Amino acid sequence: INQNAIALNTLVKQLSSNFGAISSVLNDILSRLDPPEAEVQIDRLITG
Amino acid sequence: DGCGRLSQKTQPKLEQFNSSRRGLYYFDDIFRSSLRVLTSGYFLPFGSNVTRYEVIYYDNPLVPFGHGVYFAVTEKSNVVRGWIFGSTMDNTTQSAVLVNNGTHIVVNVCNFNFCADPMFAVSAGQSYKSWIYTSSTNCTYFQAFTHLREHVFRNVDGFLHVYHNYEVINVQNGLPSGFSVLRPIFKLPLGLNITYIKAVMTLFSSTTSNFIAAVASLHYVGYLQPRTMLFHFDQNGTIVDAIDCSQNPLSELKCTTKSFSLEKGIYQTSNFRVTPTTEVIRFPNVTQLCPFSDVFNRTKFPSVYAWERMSIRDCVADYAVLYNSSISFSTFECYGVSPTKLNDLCFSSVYADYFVVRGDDVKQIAPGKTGVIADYNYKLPDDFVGCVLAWNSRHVDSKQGFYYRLFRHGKIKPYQRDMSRELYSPSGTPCTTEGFNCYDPLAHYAFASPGIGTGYQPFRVVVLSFQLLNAPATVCGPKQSTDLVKNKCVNFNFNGLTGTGVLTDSVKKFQPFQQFGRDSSDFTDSVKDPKTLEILDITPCSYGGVSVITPGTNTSDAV
């Protein structure tokens, strides 16, 4: 039970990492960059 | 050739049929054979609110174009042969006319003066006048119920796409149901602003006058909407079936599996039912422009070695006012933020630096570069966020007294001022007077020799730096608020924070100097309204899970 709970909690909390992008949040990236530049930022988050 | 008159005005009648499962077209030239692809775009939803018009009965209302218009005609004879495209339907703005007269197609883009009731004319079973317009101004472009024709009109990137389809039906009244596919024919390039679409139809008379609508025809209009659909391609590539993934609970389950048949069991589905339509924009209400004149029309700029800093706050930033002025920037680069979206943000700490440099030294005011200015005069941090502006001032700054630092032991840090005058010695030995082994650190810009080159001309440089989404903002773009909507999942924008979700009420207590509510997963949940000074709540439009039980495709369709 503890293993399942820990796995779920870690999966939930893994979203805080931004990998190689500029921010973990996706709203601000689209709020300051053009889509041609935002696609590169979104791709690494998707892969991670 | 002039235009006729119709004093009689019968009130138009409006009825509501449905489009069944029609209004599909080849959305791309990519040849797909024997596969299924899920594509999103602007299509006609199944079972739409199609409208019918008839033809004294003469209805030619101004139909808004929107994102696209679906046009289908049912007739026994050629009576409908053209359409009118335009924005104001006058001679002030250009308009497009497409009619069928001869060899290929008659299409014209011009400044027309349409009459009240544009129409064709056929007398004694032969061609007659063309009472559509009466004047053609300065224009460029020129190029030359058993019947059911369907046309789809779309205008994107200045291209007008036309789709055609022909079918044979025998129905006295009512739009027939079934499946139809349209193939593109025209890709006419013309840059216009299409907002309204009209139709032109022929009228018949006996010899020359007393035109009457002897022949009646039925045509339907449909509005395209943003929908997600799944398509199937045969070996030839012809579309044979499709599903609109918003109609019934079975539709989204079928779309998720990416198939056309289902097995008995229970499956999990995604969200394909609710889409926000309302927007909630909120900005703090202040009204005052920045002192653009005080920074772009300051009669005195210092040298680069003595650059000065200015603070900007409590503004409504508007870069469009700079167009009216007589300033022509020769360099405009931005780092971090895109220049396109500079009017939809809220800056938190704006600072400006101004000085004078040589014409060939403008390039050295970028981060990560080298040069005497970048080493001893002015350096930018590697994480600089802002924009750089520069312009020529050969007519105000053709004087003497400007200097730059030439000799210095170390390299200055970013954002550092080194206004000094002490003597310099390469060996580090202290000096006592200017002469041998002692030189003046500063050097002159000349700027007084007649007939100097472009690279040696004086230039004025202004650097803007700001921070985003860390502290409460004082400078924001020129945007107006649209009050507050409750109990709906909508698209909000609070000081440049796009999001989606329901907002009803909040009871959370927090500390001042706060504008956003974070989370352990970096997902926004609360926000402070800058206009009502009260906290709100954000919750996604979809929260729970949905499962659908089906007995099989052969068995039945009830779920």
Added chain:
Amino acid sequence: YQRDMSRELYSPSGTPCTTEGFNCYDPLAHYAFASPGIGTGYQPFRVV
């Protein structure tokens, strides 16, 4: 890819105009291109 060949008067407040004057201005402006000894930035250019 849009063409906006128009000549109607412009008003910042959106109120329709009747003549050029107060609160009504000409949308188009001149390139000069005739002053002697203009700079390189003010010279005409041809773009394809």
Added chain:
Amino acid sequence: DYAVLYNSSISFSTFECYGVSPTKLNDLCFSSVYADYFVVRGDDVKQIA
């Protein structure tokens, strides 16, 4: 030592570097340095990239 070029009366209108960063040009050791010089038109400077 690129800093000695500042004392001279030469004003470069184009300075681009590939592979190595201009900032750290004084903390390296080059192995095989070669130089080529010629004369071109003003509008043909961009074609030397």
Added chain:
Amino acid sequence: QPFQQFGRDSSDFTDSVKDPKTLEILDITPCSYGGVSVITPGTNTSDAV
């Protein structure tokens, strides 16, 4: 069908093409199709395979 210049596939691998000069369809097949296996008795044993 007409208005076609390339032959696609479910894996986006070209297999057919229309010659613009003879106006007839061709076929594309990779130079290597089958699998090859080699049996060896060991380096010390011999070199015949």
